[PDB]
Curated annotation (Swiss-Prot), chain C:
Core subunit of the mitochondrial membrane respiratory chain NADH dehydrogenase (Complex I) which catalyzes electron transfer from NADH through the respiratory chain, using ubiquinone as an electron acceptor. Essential for the catalytic activity and assembly of complex I. The chain holds residues 43 to 248 of 263 of the full protein. Core subunit of respiratory chain NADH dehydrogenase (Complex I) which is composed of 45 different subunits. Interacts with NDUFAF3. Interacts with RAB5IF. Found in subcomplexes containing subunits NDUFS2, MT-ND1 and NDUFA13. It comes from Mus musculus. Keywords: Electron transport, Membrane, Mitochondrion, Mitochondrion inner membrane, NAD, Oxidoreductase, Respiratory chain, Transit peptide, Translocase, Transport, Ubiquinone. This is NADH dehydrogenase [ubiquinone] iron-sulfur protein 3, mitochondrial. The lineage of its organism: Eukaryota, Metazoa, Chordata, Craniata, Vertebrata. Belongs to the complex I 30 kDa subunit family. It is found in: Mitochondrion inner membrane.
UniProtKB/Swiss-Prot annotation, chain E:
It comes from Mus musculus (Mouse). This is NADH-ubiquinone oxidoreductase 75 kDa subunit, mitochondrial. The chain holds residues 292 to 437 of 727 of the full protein. It is found in: Mitochondrion inner membrane. Brain. More abundant in neurons than in astrocytes (at protein level). Core subunit of the mitochondrial membrane respiratory chain NADH dehydrogenase (Complex I) which catalyzes electron transfer from NADH through the respiratory chain, using ubiquinone as an electron acceptor. Essential for catalysing the entry and efficient transfer of electrons within complex I. Plays a key role in the assembly and stability of complex I and participates in the association of complex I with ubiquinol-cytochrome reductase complex (Complex III) to form supercomplexes. Core subunit of respiratory chain NADH dehydrogenase (Complex I) which is composed of 45 different subunits. This is the largest subunit of complex I and it is a component of the iron-sulfur (IP) fragment of the enzyme. Complex I associates with ubiquinol-cytochrome reductase complex (Complex III) to form supercomplexes. In astrocytes, less complex I is assembled into supercomplexes as compared to neurons. Interacts with MDM2. Interacts with AKAP1. Belongs to the complex I 75 kDa subunit family.
UniProtKB/Swiss-Prot annotation, chain F:
This is NADH dehydrogenase [ubiquinone] iron-sulfur protein 4, mitochondrial. Keywords: Electron transport, Membrane, Mitochondrion, Mitochondrion inner membrane, Phosphoprotein, Respiratory chain, Transit peptide, Transport. Disruption phenotype: Reduces the levels of assembled mitochondrial membrane respiratory chain NADH dehydrogenase (Complex I) and the rate of Complex I-driven oxygen consumption. Growth is retarded although activity and behavior are not affected during the first 4 weeks. With aging, results in increasing lethargy, rapid deterioration of motor ability, weight loss followed by death. Mitochondrial ultrastructure is normal, although large subsarcolemmal clusters of mitochondria are present in the soleus. The gene is Ndufs4. This is a component of the iron-sulfur (IP) fragment of the enzyme. Interacts with BCAP31 and TOMM40; the interaction mediates its translocation to the mitochondria; the interaction with BCAP31 is direct. Accessory subunit of the mitochondrial membrane respiratory chain NADH dehydrogenase (Complex I), that is believed not to be involved in catalysis. Complex I functions in the transfer of electrons from NADH to the respiratory chain. The immediate electron acceptor for the enzyme is believed to be ubiquinone. Signal peptide: none annotated. The chain holds residues 51 to 175 of 175 of the full protein. The modification Phosphoserine is found at residue 123.
From Swiss-Prot, chain G:
It is found in: Mitochondrion inner membrane. The gene is Ndufa6. It is a peripheral membrane protein. Disulfide bonds: none annotated. This is NADH dehydrogenase [ubiquinone] 1 alpha subcomplex subunit 6. One of its GO terms (biological process) is aerobic respiration. Belongs to the complex I LYR family.
Length: 291, 83, 206, 95, 146, 125, 114, 134
């Protein structure tokens, strides 16, 4: 476009891809692999941090000497988030938590803060506003963690239309909150989870495509396992609040029309294949349903 | 449908390309007078095959080897293409 | 004359006459013994007669050269037998040195000398690592200097300086992974080779 | 004592400031742009001309073993003056 | 001293018209989609290409071969060359048949009203080279020139 | 003992060089030009075999210049053209030769600058 | 052309010397993956191995083949033992770097790569 | 507007008046997103249903061996003949050479320095013009 956004350069790790981006919540599980698939291919990924500088060291690498910068902010401050994205071809919103605090609730975090990032992004001449709500989240779900999130899916479009939205199904990866939960201690609860990179690649793949300019995606993956068959399979392999445990038994869907992965540039990896590496920290084939 | 081209590959001096050189001095002008707006073209490398390409409408082409072919047969070889 | 590293003419003849002593005694597989102005000896031979000259030089009174120092491999990628492989020895008894060099293609293996000089246990092996020049009868050939998954033979003049891989840590797999080579500064090949031969009577006519 | 872009960023000796539409300014966020205010082109015109005698002279940078190899100049130009590429001094002939 | 021109007012990206009507910046796959789709519409002889200037003979053949499969052969160039007889034919009408080295091996020239000095200045050096060293005499037609 | 064979003498498996820098890599064999600034000509007499060039992008942080192909700065000095092709074919690379450009032996007679008849009568001595 | 032979004669004697090596690598996928943990189960490890021997089938020279056995034995001698690590054995796969488009049309949307 | 490269930035093959076809070995890669000219037309084909049988640079050269095989012989001249055929072919033509002074477009030094899309676009040339018109 201008002169130096250009993706002239092969491969990665000293290249360029014009994917100058601002991933917010990339300090825990999900965004670190996002920055990995960005920072490897050559992409000046900003990372706004509001936590310890030591809790972000593992982000210093997977970043090739300038493509990874850092800066301070706080979600309860107008115009700092604006300052963070004055220079942003792209924006990504991974923010979220599985529990309310004295300061922040499910309500404040998934909805009110993306609302300002949404307005903040449009006040600059941005292009893309990749957001991450979660699947199983129309409204009136049995918990509260999800019924708030869908409002953000309503309240973004009234701020920044034509915004990618990924509502994926459950995620598994090393250092997760999902498999490790089960590991460290039931029919009518069935769930097709999704490997992390298979989510991360699409997002990285979604920030360059000509399509995906408002289309709501949902990354699900194969092998719709049954819980009781799966939870014992973990036990077969290895050898807490309301709105989270309430979120466990809610998990039930079927895909109506939604795009998914293979119409984005991804080959989804099943669970059983890359499942040992995460459960290897607890050491000494499950049944599927289509419905 | 139509031919819309003729072209000529030869060697400037060799036994193999002989007859083409005879073909030119002996008939070339009259064919170009019979076929004025027909885009002919004629070229003479050193050690090439004496070949003859000719297009059609959908960029389709054929080849006719004419190694050691005398003038009379080259002309029939040309008119069978202008058949 | 002050600044010319005085020649010391005498030992040229010692190493020249002794240079003849090894030729006529061993005319097989021996071509052009020579000597540089630097009074240091060089003996070019054929690969099929490697050991019997070494063992003359490890085991003979007038050539006690029972101590090996190097075994390199010099590239000349313009001839047939590009790899000049070089030996160089020493007398503790006679107080002098020698050089006994040979040749090979990228595949014309050379029988080893470890029965003669076990000093060459690893000097031989780096050449296998660094040039891909196999040796017969060498115990436990294997890599020395390169990674345990490094293809190639880098001291070859065909292998670029910065090679064909660079490593790093891709956190998604928790490993030190490799992907292709992607610099930031591009080593800048200079044309520091001026005209003006600088060394006449020492040169190549067409 | 430098000149500044309308976006508000500092210009170097050279006109070097990034345009508005440039993601490069990120690196200055919560930092600042290092710059030397001592433009040589401003300092050097703030130096008087040494109006010497004979048309040809030697120059030095304040110490013969300590800068500006001994180049000479032909100071025949009464219109302009003569410079030395090392320094930025200027000279006249006095006549 | 033309290389300075190679970094001055130079194109970078595949641009295309705007719904407003002016030009903008897009991708290759954004643009060529607009082209081959149009190519499939107009075919046969409503189609032509103008080479000229500074072009390969690799693109010319492919560019030819492209319009060769749309029944359109109107491939033209900027400056004219005659065609009323054997124009493109007979490669002795658009060449230096004479070896430019052979210009030394020549006692006479008729320059027709063009400037070697300004069109290919270095056909003029082999003239002036063969004007001084070996004898030579030239006669020119039209446009008195220095 | 010995064995007979007449084959192309491939080596391309013994180097790594996985797939890209084998096939899609032209090679230029030539006698380098005389750097016309200098009248010196020792850079000739040789058969340097440098390879084609590819992307040299600009490192967006420093302004540095960077690359992907390590196989770009790859000079190789040979002594005869007949040996060069044998070396590059031995690794399967699509050589592209340029021949020598010998300069002619020219007659340059000092006195002919000072002719009565002729047209080479120089000025300024 | 009356060359010196090494370790074998015309190819079809060197082709069993090959199989002595596949006779080891085929039985040393399961020993590695367990002793030093990995992700591959056993099979795609064996697919990769044969995918390397079905790269060098184009060879036609005994001397070359008698050489390529050796470098396989080294990596085997490095693999049979623990001298490697989980990063060296799992290095062949090219797991991470995206395979470029083998076609033409996608090959130049990025890269001046003929 | 499909940005193509320039002679410094492609492996092309131009030719001179003599017919001594020659080559442009590449030095730089073009800026931004621009690509090579022929490299496009292969795509403009394949995006449609059309498809040329090319996947490299050499195929394109092998095409030239089929069209007019002078464009591969580097530094050599396709030594030509057969002009009299044109003259016979052309003597039958008959036209009018009107009574004007034939003049070229290049007439002095100031109309030299600016031509054909490159020299136009540089200051270093117009400095000559800016100097020569004074
Ligand atoms: N991981 C999972 O199991 C799944 C997650 N998701 C969604 O994916 C996204 C990623 O969450 P994940 O990364 O997995 O879990 P994390 O625990 O890594 O939380 C993600 C980030 O949100 C940041 N954050 C939370 N609240 C605030 C706040 N008030 N102000 C600023 N930053 C804040 C956290 O900062 P800190 O680093 O200080 O915690 C953290 O870095 C969320 O939207 C989540 O709902 C969807 C499906 C499955
Ligand atoms: Zn000075």
């Amino acid at each position: 476009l201008h002169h130096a956004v250009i993706p002239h350069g092969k491969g990665g790790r000293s290249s360029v891809s014009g994917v100058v981006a601002t991933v917010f919540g990339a300090t825990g599980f999900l965004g670190r692999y996002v920055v990995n698939h960005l920072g490897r291919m050559g992409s000046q990924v900003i990372i706004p941090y509001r936590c310890d500088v030591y809790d972000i060291m593992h982000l210093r690498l997977m970043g090739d000497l300038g493509q990874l910068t850092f800066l301070e902010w706080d979600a309860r401050d107008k115009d700092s988030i604006r300052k963070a994205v004055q220079h942003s071809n792209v924006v990504i919103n991974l923010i979220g938590r599985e529990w309310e605090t004295r300061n922040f609730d499910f309500e404040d975090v998934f909805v009110n803060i993306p609302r300002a990032i949404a307005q903040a992004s449009k006040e600059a001449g941005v292009e893309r506003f990749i957001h991450v709500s979660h699947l199983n989240a129309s409204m009136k779900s049995s918990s509260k963690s999800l019924r708030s999130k869908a409002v953000g899916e309503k309240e973004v479009r009234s701020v920044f239309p034509e915004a990618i939205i990924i509502r994926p199904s459950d995620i598994f990866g090393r250092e997760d909150r999902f498999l490790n939960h089960f590991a460290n201690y039931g029919f009518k609860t069935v769930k097709q989870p999704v490997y992390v990179a298979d989510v991360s690649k699409g997002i990285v793949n979604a920030t360059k495509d000509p399509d995906a300019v408002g289309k709501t995606f949902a990354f699900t993956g194969p092998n719709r396992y049954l819980l009781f068959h799966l939870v014992k399979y973990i036990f077969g392999m290895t050898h807490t609040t309301k709105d989270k445990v309430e979120r466990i038994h809610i998990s039930d869907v079927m895909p109506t029309d939604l795009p998914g992965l293979e119409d984005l540039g991804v080959q989804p990896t099943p669970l059983e294949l890359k499942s040992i590496e995460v459960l290897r920290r607890h050491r000494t084939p499950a049944k599927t349903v289509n419905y | 449908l139509g031919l819309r081209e003729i072209r000529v590959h030869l060697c400037q001096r060799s036994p193999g390309s002989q007859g083409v050189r005879d073909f030119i001095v002996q008939r070339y002008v009259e064919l170009k007078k019979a076929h004025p707006n027909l885009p002919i073209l004629i070229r003479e490398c050193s050690e090439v095959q004496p070949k003859l390409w000719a297009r059609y409408a959908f960029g389709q082409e054929k080849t006719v080897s004419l190694n050691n072919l005398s003038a009379d047969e080259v002309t029939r070889a040309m008119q069978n293409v202008l058949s | 004359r002050p600044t010319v590293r005085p020649r010391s003419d005498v030992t040229h003849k010692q190493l020249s006459a002794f240079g003849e002593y090894v030729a006529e005694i061993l005319p097989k597989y021996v071509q052009q013994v020579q000597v540089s102005c630097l009074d240091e000896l060089e003996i070019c031979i054929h690969p099929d007669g490697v050991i019997p000259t070494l063992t003359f030089l490890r085991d003979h009174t007038n050539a006690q050269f029972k101590s090996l120092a190097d075994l390199t491999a010099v590239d000349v990628p313009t001839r047939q037998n590009r790899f000049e492989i070089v030996y160089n020895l020493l007398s503790l008894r006679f107080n002098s040195r020698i050089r006994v060099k040979t040749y090979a293609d990228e595949l014309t293996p050379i029988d080893s000398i470890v029965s003669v000089h076990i000093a060459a246990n690893w000097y031989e092996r780096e050449v296998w690592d660094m040039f891909g020049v196999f040796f017969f009868n060498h115990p436990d050939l294997r890599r020395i200097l390169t990674d345990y998954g490094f293809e190639g033979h880098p001291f070859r003049k065909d292998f670029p300086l910065t090679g064909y891989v660079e490593l790093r840590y891709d956190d998604e797999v928790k490993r030190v992974v490799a992907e292709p080579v992607e610099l930031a500064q591009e080593f800048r090949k200079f044309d520091l080779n001026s005209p003006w031969e600088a060394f006449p009577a020492y040169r190549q006519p067409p | 004592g430098v000149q500044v872009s309308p976006s508000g960023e500092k210009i170097t000796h050279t006109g070097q400031v990034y345009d508005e539409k440039d993601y490069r300014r990120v690196r200055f966020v919560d930092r600042q742009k290092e710059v030397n205010e001592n433009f040589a082109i401003d300092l050097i015109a703030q130096q008087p001309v040494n109006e010497v005698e004979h048309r040809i002279i030697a120059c030095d940078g304040g110490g013969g073993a300590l800068g500006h190899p001994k180049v000479y100049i032909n100071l025949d130009k009464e219109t302009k003056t003569g410079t030395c590429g090392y320094c930025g001094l200027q000279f006249k002939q006095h006549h | 001293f033309a290389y300075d021109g190679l970094k001055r007012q130079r194109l970078t990206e595949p641009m295309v018209r705007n719904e407003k009507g002016l030009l903008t910046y897009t991708s290759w796959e954004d643009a060529l989609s607009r082209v081959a789709g149009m190519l499939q519409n107009f075919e046969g002889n409503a189609v032509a290409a103008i080479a000229g200037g500074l072009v390969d003979a690799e693109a010319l053949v492919a560019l030819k071969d492209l319009l060769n499969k749309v029944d359109s052969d109107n491939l033209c160039t900027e400056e004219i060359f005659p065609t009323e007889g054997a124009g493109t034919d007979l490669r002795s009408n658009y060449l230096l048949n004479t070896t430019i080295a052979g210009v030394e091996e020549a006692d006479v020239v008729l320059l027709v009203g063009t400037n070697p000095r300004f069109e290919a200045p270095l056909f003029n050096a082999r003239i002036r080279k063969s004007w001084l060293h070996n004898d030579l005499k030239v006669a020119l037609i039209g446009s008195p020139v220095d | 003992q010995l064995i007979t064979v007449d084959e192309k003498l491939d080596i391309t498996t013994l180097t790594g060089v996985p797939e890209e820098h084998i096939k899609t890599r032209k090679v230029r064999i030539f006698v380098p030009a005389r750097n016309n600034m200098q009248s010196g000509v020792n850079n000739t007499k040789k058969w340097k075999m440098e390879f084609d060039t590819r992307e040299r992008w600009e490192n967006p942080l420093m302004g540095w210049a960077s690359t992907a192909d390590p196989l770009s700065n790859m000079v190789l000095t040979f002594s005869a053209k007949e040996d060069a092709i044998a070396f590059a074919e031995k690794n399967g690379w699509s050589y592209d030769v340029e021949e020598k450009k010998v300069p002619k032996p020219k007659s340059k007679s000092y006195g002919a600058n000072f002719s009565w008849n002729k047209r080479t009568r120089v000025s300024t001595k | 052309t009356s060359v010196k032979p090494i370790f074998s004669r015309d190819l079809n004697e060197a082709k069993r010397r090959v199989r002595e090596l596949y006779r080891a690598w085929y039985r040393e996928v399961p020993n590695t993956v367990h002793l030093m943990q990995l992700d591959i189960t056993v099979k795609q490890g064996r697919d990769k191995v044969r995918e390397m021997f079905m790269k060098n089938a184009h060879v036609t020279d005994p001397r070359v083949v008698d050489l390529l056995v050796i470098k396989g034995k080294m990596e085997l001698q490095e693999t049979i033992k623990v001298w490697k690590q989980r990063t060296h054995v799992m290095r062949f796969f090219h797991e991470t770097e995206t395979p470029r488009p083998k076609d033409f049309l996608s090959k130049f949307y990025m890269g001046h790569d003929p | 507007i499909l940005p193509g490269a320039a002679y410094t930035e492609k492996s092309a093959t131009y030719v001179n008046t003599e017919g001594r076809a020659q080559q442009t070995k590449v030095a730089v890669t073009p800026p931004g997103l621009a690509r090579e000219d022929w490299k496009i037309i292969r795509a403009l084909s394949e995006i449609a249903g059309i498809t040329l049988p090319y996947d490299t640079l050499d195929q394109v050269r092998n095409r030239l061996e089929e069209v007019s095989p002078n464009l591969v012989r580097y530094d050599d001249i396709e030594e030509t003949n057969y002009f009299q055929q044109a003259s016979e072919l052309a003597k039958l033509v008959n036209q009018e050479v009107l009574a004007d002074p034939l003049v070229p477009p290049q007439l002095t030094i100031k109309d030299f320095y600016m031509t054909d899309s490159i020299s136009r676009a540089s200051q270093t040339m117009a400095k000559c013009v800016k100097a020569v018109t004074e």
